[model samples]
Target chain A: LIYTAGGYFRQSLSYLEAYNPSDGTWLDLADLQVPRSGLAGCVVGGLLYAVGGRNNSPDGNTDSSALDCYNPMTNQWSPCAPMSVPRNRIGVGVIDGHIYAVGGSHGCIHHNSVERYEPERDEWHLVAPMLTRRIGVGVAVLNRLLYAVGGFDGTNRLNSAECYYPERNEWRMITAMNTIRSGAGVCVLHNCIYAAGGYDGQDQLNSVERYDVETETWTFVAPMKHRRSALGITVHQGRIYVLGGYDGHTFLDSVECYDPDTDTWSEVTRMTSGRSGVGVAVTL
Target chain B: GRLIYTAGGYFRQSLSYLEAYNPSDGTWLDLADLQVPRSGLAGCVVGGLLYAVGGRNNSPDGNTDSSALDCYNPMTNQWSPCAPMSVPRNRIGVGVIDGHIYAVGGSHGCIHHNSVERYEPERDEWHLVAPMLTRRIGVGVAVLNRLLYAVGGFDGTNRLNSAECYYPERNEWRMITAMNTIRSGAGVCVLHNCIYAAGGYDGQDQLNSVERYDVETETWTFVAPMKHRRSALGITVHQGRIYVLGGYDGHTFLDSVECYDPDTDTWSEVTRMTSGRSGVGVAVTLE
Candidate 1:
């Protein structure tokens, strides 16, 4: 099961939708407790954790460090401890029952600081900072390590990845993507991390690349048909699900599914609304 | 009509012991040893003479690079010294084109050499040829239709997918389409007019993946893999099939030999050497 959580429309929207991959249908779920944009989501202990975003408005800019946990058993939204600081456009990853919130921006402030949320303790703790400050980063956990993929750093859109070791609480600047992108959708599939569809400085891009952990190198893969930035990405049943994103021209509600074996993407059903920078997570 | 020679490599230490295999009766013959104990050399056959080039010698005091080249006269079963390379290297790539032996990229230690050289048996000397674009070591070189193809190796930073082919007539090396995987210490040979690259280390793992490169299309496609994942193995072609022997597969140094039937795209275990060998050199001659 996968959930597409709260994101922007004309205003910050709290809308949430649940997807059943078996039947290729969706269930309109309960709304988020609050409407937030630029949020990221992950799953831990079979529960959905949505963290960090902003309530974007013409009147005022409000950032959310707010962490929300949704229980399928109760079908309820519950608040967890917030982050140490307000983070918008955050990257989130889960490992060993804890959720890690990576780089993001608040208002005028871009962040390099990393924080981990412990469900057992019901607290968020600061870990080591990334070498580069970024917002709109993509984060995924592969082989027990959390990898923070490309994003923007106020000055430049980045291609670099910083890997975090939970035990050591260290962020090591590692190999990067072939393309420099911010807001790219990143996920790990078959021992390789695939980064697809993002903003590459000038244009919203359709180009994609995969980093082989063993080789520590990136190779260009087939491009996506639609150019998307701030797209939501998740791996379900060996396929990559790329949800709604901005394609430069319009806010897109279209969804596409990628099959790694075929190196091909097939059009899937669109979302309930056009939402870029939306939070997406898979839960059992 | 042909004899396959397997030579000096690292076992307990860099070995000088040489052995020959007669495919006719399927027997192994122990022959003359090299003058210096070294491993990671490249061997090729020229005018019924076998030449062993650039390798590093392991010793207690320090390691020695064998700029020293050696030639084996199968008729006399004796090893003779030949003209040495100016740059002493180990894991260099060797190929024979138009009766001249070409030496491509290699490394002295961490320092990679992009400079290429050619050996003239007639003149008994070595001369500078065109250099490769990428500085590499553990590169696999094979001659197909008189053109020397250098594929997959370790550059200074990482293992390479970038490959190039050298045209002796033009005295130039031109880049070709890259391979799918970055490979170092792969064994390469020309069979069925296509270059077959087998078994190499791809930074993360010992690979058993095999790929065939077609020059006309400048493309690579996957072929059947070997029985074991191995690197620094010795490879040669005989009759119609490709034979690979002795390499390290992360866990153990291998003594087994496997042959690939291109007709069926299948691999079968053929035989094993008396001892396990890694960084081994192999060549074939019409004896």
Candidate 2:
């Protein structure tokens, strides 16, 4: 079962505990503290932590610096350590039990900054600034290194790829995507990182691409049926799930799923609600 | 019960048909068309008279600019020319209070405007009022307790999350809590003392979010997200729920419809329309 959180003009939080993956039905869960949209979140140690999003509007309502942690095991939310700067459209990941918060933007401007939090100490220490300042990017961990993909800089959409190595404490540019986009949903499936559905400033793109950490190369995969940016994507039941995002100027709630084994994309039932710039986390 | 009427819009490129939706039956019936094609205009009903204020005309060559105002009488089902605005504009905000219709900021070509003009039906004249504090395009406006409310519009480069309320009695404008999203081209409607803003463009993106403002509390709260992102969409309150109509998504125009229930803070899918159109002005008729 998974819980979905999304917001609109004001912002709302809803959950589905007894979610049926096959039928796409949501069971109910507890709502969040205040209504928020354009948020980003991650699950660590069975706890879900959501961070910055715009105020009422998706792009830049108000820069939110507040971070809250939710425990599915207990069905409660607890306040977490604060981030130094307020931001929205951010990317977050957890590796080796340590939460790595990566690039996103505050306003129209993008941020390349990276920070890590030690829950034991309740402290956030700055690690390094990314090579590119971008928002609506995706972060995933593979082979002990962090991978960031598909975010936008101030001037244009970015397809540039980078890797963060903790052991060397250095950042390296790896490969560029065949399609340049921002706000595309990304996930780690079948030992490879996949990016799907984003915009190139002019139009929404449905292309899907992947990066192989072992080979340090990128592969073009099947594209999504719909193009979107700031999409919510997750890996559930050995399949990749993609939720809402803004297709150009319009927000969308259309849901689609792709199977790596089948090498095909299937349309799941659409969400009961339509939203964009949403956050997603799974209990499993 | 509110009677909703569908009118021609998109400025100089006006739609041909008109339909009126009766809340009693929850059905839309085709009625009449506009005398001329126009969109991005402001509309209001006073004493059963549907008056359309200044709107822009399509340049035909693809230059989007308009500065025309036309009035329509529902009883006669005909349109008559009204006093033109001081300047040519489209995407303007229009509302009626105290038998006078007020026209707010609008867009002239690529320029956003802040001029305020009022039309006195009795005198058949246009009077200048205090201009808006901020110039914008695709702003949503409504009247609550005799006060004019403007919410969520684009200032030219980006969308604005700020809001302003105008007091017609005092001829003054006061700022209020800004919306959660900075956007433009959404629809605004008033029910009792509360105002609802639904569906519009958020600069580089479109939105499905709806927010409500309470006149008593002077605060805003999250209501419900629309089923689709609509800009140049139509919004009205009828039979207790808020109804949203057609608007265009960048890829394609839309006629998808949805309604929001304030009591439940939830949304339910309604009926879909025949056309995928945006910037179509809608007015609910009451019998």
Candidate 3:
């Protein structure tokens, strides 16, 4: 099991913990070195790599290149090679023992930097940057292909979406979202990508839309219990868990779980701490 | 279980009226008007008598500040005059340590002061004490281990990030750890030796950031920041949770009441106040 911790001002840190589905509990393992906000993570070859988050925002300054890894069993964190450049609010996925970090904020600049990290070679090689320099975007892997969608370029929120092909290291624009949002939650389930609960400029949103890879289109799904922004979302046990996030004014402690089979959401046990910009992880 | 008591203060509109709230029913009951219809006040309870201190009656229409001090007895439900302060200032911090009410830094019109005065309720007289290190207009002050720690406030040019501690035994002032965020018109309280500072304006914007100062280590640690950014908020402790009442968040006034638990380092929303107000005083009536 993995738990994501992030906040509005700092980058989210994703922690790996083992959860027993038979009995509901988690055992915390090692922690990441530089916990960041709006970060995404993936596991390959038993190594967890966290990638892409803004350095820090509340105080408004740039941070160093943070691309760190953790080994759960050993209970330690060690530095790997940094990304070719810096990013915050990006996505990461593991494919065939290689980790891919997708688009995020590059200082005052939004980015299309896609880089791959390999633990075996202890090296980082640059991949083709995406077609969009978008920050706070969501990335999901469905049917072995990476789909990147819905982020802000600082000026405006976007609906433009694309998919990354590891074989060609190239990205193709997919069907755009029905709504333009930057801070929504995204996850891939059953060969489809789901985006849920985020904000546009005007108000908080509870919209959930699904992208079908086979059809190359978008569909509306069940919305969240409440409109939220800066959410940390994860899928486990056929249910999606959304921990604490901001609902415009206040940081919410309410945890809502959505069951795909039921196509509905229910209240779960609240978090120990109510915070925003938290990262989340899950055991598949 | 504690009862909410409304200490004296006028709102943006002129009214000496005050009200108390019972969370069980979420109802407010009106009390008597203060002797002076002043706002931007300070108050504290000593020996079961609540003392309402310095504030201006209106928003500087003609009056700049108030030196009229009134003491209220809950048992009798009546008020009597106490010795007025040497300097008329509002937005003051008041507390009683060893039966003496220490009235700390405040402001009078355009002036921010560091003048410290002690009032003897028995003698009905006021005497000067050690001045604060920084002259703050609306400083947040709390006493721990007989030491007074004054948190952030307006230091004239900008909202201050400096904090200082005064030793009652030594009658001297010393600088302490400063807050991470510079704020003014905020609330301060000490829960378990950790001084909690919350909800202040940073000159330009209101903030919800909560900073905790460790008395033992003399260091500051960032706690759970508030969900709402408000200034001039009222705070009181009840059942181990700090209850923060109404304040202004720049754009709008608020009636939201938030609770902060030091044990878990989190905030929870509770029953809100009836009216949105800033520069109001709060006291919880414990049975």
Candidate 4:
């Protein structure tokens, strides 16, 4: 099951849509707890967690720290403990069964503060903050450490990269990408962090970079055919998958996949609706 | 133990005045001068020898970057040249770790850099190491438990509140927790395993606030702010306290001195320097 919910068009939405890749069918699921946009979702311990996002439609709206959990088995949504800091445009990743929420914004100021959600305890704990305050960041977990990639760090569209070491509970700087990015789609494939298309503060970006953990270096790889920002990214069956995103001109309904073995990107089936600020999760 | 003061630049003039401050009688003694008149240089003690790296020399026209590497032997009261850097730089953050001097971020001409190089005295050579993730100028660098830590500085755009640490064994630079305030030209020192970043400019105004970083917890906490808002000051640790020397406070050069005690989280003004100075370099030799 692939899930995508509320996003903005003329107004904030509470629409819920799910895709069944096996049968190539799309179905409307239950609406979200609230009409929202710019939300991020990740699966942890067999549950889909929808973290922070924006609530009101026309930009500069209030942010939502509401942490909502979804159960496909029952097709229901339940509210969990909210984040201590309310923010939208957040980057989230799962490390050691806990959801580590990275940088975001609270409508006014950019945030560097990070918080972690423990599902079992139903509690959110403040972790080590990022060195730079950024929003629309891309995050992924590799080797049990959370890697935060590019975003707008208040001053500039950042190419800077840093990772959080859970054991030491610290963040360390890594080599930056060749291009500055914000709202980039990030996912991990075979221990390497792959960053897909994003906005570079000017035009939409089709550039991509692969970060090797062992060497701590970033090199340009094959770029996507279409530009994207605020896209939905996930990994399924060892292939990187990207969903709907805005391309500066239009909302995207296209889907694409990157095959590392071939080092190529191919267009997959398109989404039912063109949307940005969408949520994505692949059920096992 | 003796205090070592090195060359500094003021206005259009640079200094070659290498001196030692005698705490025993509170007096200064002139030693052998530097081969080049420079300011904004970084100095550190490695194996009982004082090593001076790059600084700006304002002679004919002004060259704000120098690759000159000079060393001084207090035992012999003599100065000698060592291997120069690959790139000319000034306003660098330098520290001594495991008998090696690590020079971190600085400016090359007007461009800020993230390049880091290490000087090994045994080989008399300088080699490139893992560069910092961010370009910095007027950063405060210190060494604690054999790891090099760099604090606040200007990143060509904004005054930074960020911090990063480098592990020599791993040859990696890690972004640690940031300081409480954004600053540049602040002074840094390590005392009892804690790193302290003192007065600096925060883009808008000269700052007097000071913060301490605890490595174990990877957190920064405000200790006590300095009495004078200053930047480009000299800092060192002696007898469990931090000594802050001359710097600019946005208006004029500062020669007044102050000392901070971590145990009490307080600062006390000390005797002023003979002349007002900024971008001064101060070090201590443990006999």
Best by lDDT: 1
DockQ of 1: 0.03
Per-residue C-alpha lDDT of model 1 across residues B106-182, encoded as one tens digit per residue? 88876789899988999988899888766779999988989999887876655665577788889887656566555
DockQ of candidates 1 onward, in order? 0.03, 0.02, 0.01, 0.08
Off by over 4 Å in 1: A1-284
Q: Quick one: ranking by TM-score, best first?
A: 4, 1, 2, 3
lDDT score of model 3? 0.72
Against the true structure, whose TM-score is highest? 4
The iRMS of the candidates, in order, is 12.8, 15.8, 21.2, 6.2
The order by descending DockQ is 4, 1, 2, 3
> Candidate 4 residues A111-156, lDDT tens each?
9999988898999999888877879999988888888888886656
lDDT of 1 by residue, A43-152 (tens): 88888888999987778879998999898888889998889898998988888888888889878899999988889999888888886777989987899999988888
Each candidate's fnat, listed in order, reads 0.00, 0.00, 0.00, 0.00
Weakest ten-residue segment in model 2 chain B by summed lDDT: B8-17
B1-287, model 3: which lDDT tens digit per residue?
34666565445643365666776766777766676777677766777777778876674466658776898876677788878999888888776688888888888878788889989988999999978755777788787777777777865654665677788889987655456566687888878767888988765578988888876765567789888888877777766778887778876767778889778888888767666767777666643
TM-score of chain A of 4: 0.95
Between candidates 1 and 4, the one scoring higher on lDDT is 1
How does each model score on TM-score?
A: 0.55, 0.53, 0.50, 0.66
Interface RMSD measured for model 4: 6.2
